[PDB]
Design a protein around this ligand. Structure first.
Ligand SMILES: *[C@@H]1O[C@H](CO)[C@@H](O)[C@H](O)[C@H]1NC(C)=O
Ligand SMILES: *[C@H]1O[C@H](CO)[C@@H](O)[C@H](O)[C@H]1NC(C)=O
Ligand SMILES: *[C@H]1O[C@H](CO)[C@@H](O)[C@H](O)[C@H]1NC(C)=O
Lengths: 204, 421
């Protein structure tokens, strides 16, 4: 129960132990500004590393962002703010074979929040733009478990998704080279990482 | 597979089993360790012990709190004369899967209810493998501490809803647990600010800060209580824990014992490391039949799984009402030196819980409790019929570790004294 006090430290510890900071985010100094609650159904929540049966992650999940001015360059919530929600697998086709490392599962942009500082809010899906429609986990039988990582980014003020670099296709996020994805794409588009959650799925 | 770990020290001349009970049709391997009563295993009751976390091994309770042996700095077992298997055969279960030596390749549990389904299955397989602990009509109890305050009530409900079960449930014991968040979160400020029997540990400015944020926190908890959803429960956990628990923690003070400073590992008790090293030895793992490579006191992944799933703030206390209304004896005890699951909060949800005799209970006057073994006035009791609340003097989060003799008196007067202190 000692470890359930600081949700920030708890998040960092998880990202570290599961190589999310090095394999995906590529930043070991990353500090979450809030926490991203993601759920497929009341029985299928993505809770920082739990395992979910593939069939449950079949449709697009719901999201919620909880900001806590304390878990903290720094992200200061505002009204103009537009966000980008990403879902990627850095273990494609497996945790070892990275011929397709970083398989693009989802990319939603121009998302706005319905909304001492603290607040939990869901997103307003209305005026958003999906660059890459959602596709649930589909790991190759026998490849072992895969990491399915959700990442929330804050877009630069005033710039909509029509200005972000294109995404050829899913494998390698269309970059050709192995082990490349959200990290590469997020940087060339000046996106600011704000939160992340993840789960495991496997096909036996 | 099952093994005879007698060659280890632990408890000479007392039969015991270690090994796994499987639910292969779900790929779940539950590790357990059983110890028979040092008296009469055919007459004495059976007790299932569960630690909390969530995600911590029950072997902690075995070696560190109330089992037959503790472990010295030299990794050699030292007999515990006040072990709980003195007049009861005890079962130490690592649960959920992946905690301690328990493991599972595919599945994984994220909430208490699901963990309850698994434990019920384990018990069915258990009493099936060892009819000896039921045949002779022995009473069976479920006892645990801390987060088990979530487990126990739900667990008990799960087993009592099965009409075809192959065993019975006599009563449940819960020490320093978190059971009714909405009520208990009201007592962190008074406990940390000089109103729980110990000098304040927080400067005035902090205590006030805690009072101001109290309302918001409680509102969020109520919201979780009403919708029982992630959207409502997770935020509630984050806000309340930062507002009510973080200040105390930042002082470096021990959340398990207000009189001490947190020193050592993630659990503030340096010595726990010793049992971790003992359980990781080549000959111990083998003798025990462990099928897991590395042992750890707690698994912080499943701990986070429960947290980010919103299980922390659920209204599981309502299960206690059902149980009590069905006449299931329940003992809620708490050491008065613990902070994170202090006695004030535990006496509070116990005084206002609704049930058929909530009026007669609230009316009852607290009296002094004299431990039979030591003959010391070891605490203050309050009970009516089959509901009892015990405040244990000079006990931290882990009562048996601080007052082993008084703790043994408590469990025995309960288990052998007709469920009444
Ligand atoms: C507990 O067992 C011991 C066996 O040595 C016995 O002397 C003692 O009276 C027993 N007390 C009980 C039944 O609580
Ligand atoms: C529980 O005890 C046994 C389980 O082995 C069962 O036969 C009995 O009916 C149950 N208790 C009673 C007598 O209702
Ligand atoms: C408890 O015993 C009686 C009442 O139960 C009374 O002397 C006082 O409240 C307590 N005794 C002690 C330890 O002073």
């Amino acid at each position: 129960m000692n470890q359930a006090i600081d949700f920030a430290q708890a998040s960092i510890d998880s990202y570290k132990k599961h190589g999310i900071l090095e394999d995906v985010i590529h930043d070991t100094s990353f500090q979450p500004s809030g926490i991203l609650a993601v759920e497929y159904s009341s029985s299928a929540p993505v809770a920082m590393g739990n395992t979910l049966p593939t069939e449950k992650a079949r449709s697009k999940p719901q999201f919620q962002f909880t900001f806590n001015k304390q878990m903290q360059n720094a992200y200061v919530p505002q009204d103009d703010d537009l966000f980008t929600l990403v879902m990627t697998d850095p273990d494609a086709p497996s945790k070892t074979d990275h011929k397709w490392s970083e398989f693009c599962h989802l990319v939603e942009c121009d998302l706005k929040l319905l909304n001492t500082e603290f607040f939990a809010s869901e997103f307003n899906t209305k005026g958003s733009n999906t660059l890459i429609e959602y596709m649930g986990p589909a790991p190759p039988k026998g490849s072992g478990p895969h990491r399915y990582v959700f990442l929330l980014y804050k877009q630069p003020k005033g710039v909509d998704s029509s200005k972000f670099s294109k995404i050829k296709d899913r494998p390698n996020w269309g970059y050709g080279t192995p082990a490349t994805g959200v990290g590469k794409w997020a940087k060339e588009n000046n996106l600011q990482l704000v939160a992340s959650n993840f789960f495991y799925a496997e096909t036996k | 597979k099952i093994k005879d770990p007698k060659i280890l020290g632990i408890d000479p001349n007392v039969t015991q089993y270690t090994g796994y009970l499987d639910v292969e049709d779900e790929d779940k391997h539950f590790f357990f360790w059983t110890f028979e009563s040092r008296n009469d295993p055919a007459k004495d009751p059976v007790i299932l012990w569960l630690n909390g976390g969530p995600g911590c091994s029950s072997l902690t309770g075995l070696f560190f709190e109330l089992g037959p042996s503790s472990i010295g700095p030299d990794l050699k077992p030292i007999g515990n004369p006040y072990s709980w298997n003195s007049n009861a055969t005890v079962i130490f279960l690592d649960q959920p899967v992946n905690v301690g030596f328990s493991y599972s390749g595919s599945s994984g549990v994220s909430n208490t209810v699901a963990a309850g389904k698994d434990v019920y299955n384990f018990l069915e397989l258990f009493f099936d493998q060892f009819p000896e602990y039921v045949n002779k009509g022995q009473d069976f109890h479920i006892a645990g501490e801390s987060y088990a305050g979530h487990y126990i009530p739900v667990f008990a409900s799960e087993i009592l809803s099965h009409k075809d079960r192959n065993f019975n449930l006599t009563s449940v014991l819960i020490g320093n647990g978190l059971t009714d968040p909405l009520t208990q979160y009201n007592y962190y400020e008074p406990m940390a600010c000089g109103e729980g029997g110990e000098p304040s540990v927080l400067p005035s400015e902090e205590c006030s800060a805690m009072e101001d944020s109290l309302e918001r926190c409680l509102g969020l908890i109520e919201s979780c209580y009403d919708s029982q959803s992630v959207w409502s429960c997770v935020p509630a956990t984050i806000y309340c824990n930062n507002a009510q628990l973080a200040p105390y923690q930042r002082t470096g003070r021990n959340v398990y014992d207000i009189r001490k400073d947190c020193e050592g590992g993630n659990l503030c008790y340096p010595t726990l490391q010793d049992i971790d090293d003992y359980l990781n030895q080549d000959y111990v793992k083998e003798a025990v039949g462990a099928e897991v490579d590395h042992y750890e006191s707690c698994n912080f992944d499943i701990n986070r799984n429960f947290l980010f799933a919103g299980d922390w703030m659920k209204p599981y206390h309502t299960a206690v009402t059902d149980l009590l209304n069905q006449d299931l004896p329940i003992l809620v005890y708490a050491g008065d030196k613990d902070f994170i699951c202090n006695w004030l909060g535990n006496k509070a949800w116990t005084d206002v819980l609704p049930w058929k005799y909530d009026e007669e209970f609230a009316s009852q006057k607290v009296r002094n409790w004299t431990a039979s073994i030591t003959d010391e006035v070891a605490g203050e009791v309050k009970s009516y019929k089959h509901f009892t609340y015990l405040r244990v003097f000079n006990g931290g989060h882990m009562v048996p570790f601080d007052v082993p003799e008084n703790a043994l008196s408590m469990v025995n007067e309960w288990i052998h004294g007709g469920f009444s202190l």
